[PDB]
Amino acid sequence: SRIGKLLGFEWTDLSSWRRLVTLLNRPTDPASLAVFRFLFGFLMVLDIPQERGLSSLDRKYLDGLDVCRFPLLDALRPLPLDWMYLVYTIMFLGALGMMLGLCYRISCVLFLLPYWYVFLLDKTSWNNHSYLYGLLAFQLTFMDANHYWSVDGLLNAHRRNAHVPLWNYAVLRGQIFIVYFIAGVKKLDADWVEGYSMEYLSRHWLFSPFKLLLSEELTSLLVVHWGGLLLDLSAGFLLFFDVSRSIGLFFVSYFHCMNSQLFSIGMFSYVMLASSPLFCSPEWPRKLVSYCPRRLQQLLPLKAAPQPSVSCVYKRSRGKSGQKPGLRHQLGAAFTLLYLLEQLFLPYSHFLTQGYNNWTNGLYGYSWDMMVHSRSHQHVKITYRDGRTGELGYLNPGVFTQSRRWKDHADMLKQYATCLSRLLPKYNVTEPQIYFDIWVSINDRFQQRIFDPRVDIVQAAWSPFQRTSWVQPLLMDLSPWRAKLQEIKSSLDNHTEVVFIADFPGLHLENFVSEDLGNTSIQLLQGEVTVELVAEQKNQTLREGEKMQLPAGEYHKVYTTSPSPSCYMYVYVNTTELALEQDLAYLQELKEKVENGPTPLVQTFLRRQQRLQEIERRRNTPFHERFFRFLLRKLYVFRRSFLMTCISLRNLILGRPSLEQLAQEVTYANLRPFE
């Protein structure tokens, strides 16, 4: 058998359906599966009060507040606060049961159902690790992970070191491999291979050793971008093979240890770290507990030969011939194959749901593309027209929203428009017409509109499978300007800013220059524009290279007349900031000179000096005090969540008390126990 140890099977095992089913149901030691289940349950229990928002459920789901919500389906509606607290309690109990191994199936379902309900209840909280947690819970629901290191097996006799079918490990290994490979392939983008997505991450002190032999640009392009792409592409291949298993394990451990500190992504790094030993032999915990000193080998459960189990099948040459697969053996193989096909196909299913395709393909959360695209927003304007009288009015951007993700997606914008249309009659406004004007620059590009500002979103047509017509295309033929843009940005002073704008033909921009924005100018780059002055009604055509100067405290308009998109910049200085800083420097230096031989302006410098001194003292202060403060904050969050959940459970079960008792209980809930 040449390939009988580099792959774990033979070529003859994939020649027929019966042979494949027999292979996929091979018995296997359940030790590593049990360890993974324990770790995943522990991490989910630790994570539910923090990331899922159990501590802010009262803030998010108040009884009578006006808020616009963004569910996947408008038929899904939230429950009152008490029932939401009950659902979170059920989720916590399910996670605890999954960790402990007691009542495995019931706990798995009790964690799976409310988790997916909460996930689907809101489209603005989707990311990749929440999707991964849901997928992992779904997979573990159908697996026998309570056969070792559990409590069910300590009450039963057959779940004590039994055997599990082979596909239990195959599904998890495949899931991790698809995660790594799809992330690596998604990182084969123009903005990533050219070092544009993360151009500031290399300045962290964790990259200091690389700066000894490499330049800053070289260490930002070679290490963060190309190294990350290579590791993403090769982690699965390195981990699968036993020849290079140790090297791959070291690399992935180092990668996740740095990632747990570079960003704040919750428990993603720890889940990935705990999922790495799954690629090792299924019996590694047994060897690890055999290698420990003999003085601690008599308290843990005895290491003996595993007993036979009914879940898997046994094919022996002398121990009988063959057991015909039933409706449980073939179902495992079918589930494995179909689930792997679905996981491989879903990230590339953006050609079917065309209504979710903005500048970036699809809804964010299930495509395994992390940090690839970065967005910076410049201005948002919401304008409504009264349908009864015709007055023009302006709304605050995001009055009734608890998130900011609606500015990038057309479906979320449509939902927000409908919600505003519903809630505006409450404020003496007839049936309105709302127009949106949002300027977004992606991956350090020109600032440009994303949606058409001349279309009424309330009456617009949006369909999941139809490409949206009021979404402005991305100006793809302007990226090579980025080098010149960076040069211009770096060729400026420490108090002068620049903003680069690209405008479509036929549209116009109305801007109000602030009073304190003295020395403001506009310079053209491409095409031709017409600059207007509202107060005196004077147009002025401009060409490439020309420069203007705009007065402060007045309106002005910029019109695009060229048959191609045009680009220009704004150059401005905060003259009020300059004057304040220069007088502050005078009043400080001269005061020091007189002393060595209050008012708000002095107060700002006093606060800055106090903050600098505190920062220096904290830097000199050892990390133990910060660790203690972190522990105190976590304990406060946990205690608040527990007290509020108990309060809501008492209210739901016993009965609603008087108002006075609730106020006292709420005040006791937030106390910051000790400091």
């Binding site: 990311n127 990749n128 992504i265 919750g266 940090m371 605050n396 801007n511």
Partner: peptide, 29 residues
């Protein structure tokens, strides 16, 4: 609350935006 603003306050294109940290779409908050 008050969901209305003026015309000179809804047209200030050049202003300190907000920039609430990185706020990447994979951050917890």
């Amino acid at each position: 609350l008050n969901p209305f603003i003026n015309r000179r306050n809804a047209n200030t294109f050049i202003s300190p935006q907000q920039r609430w940290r990185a706020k990447v779409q994979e951050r917890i908050r």
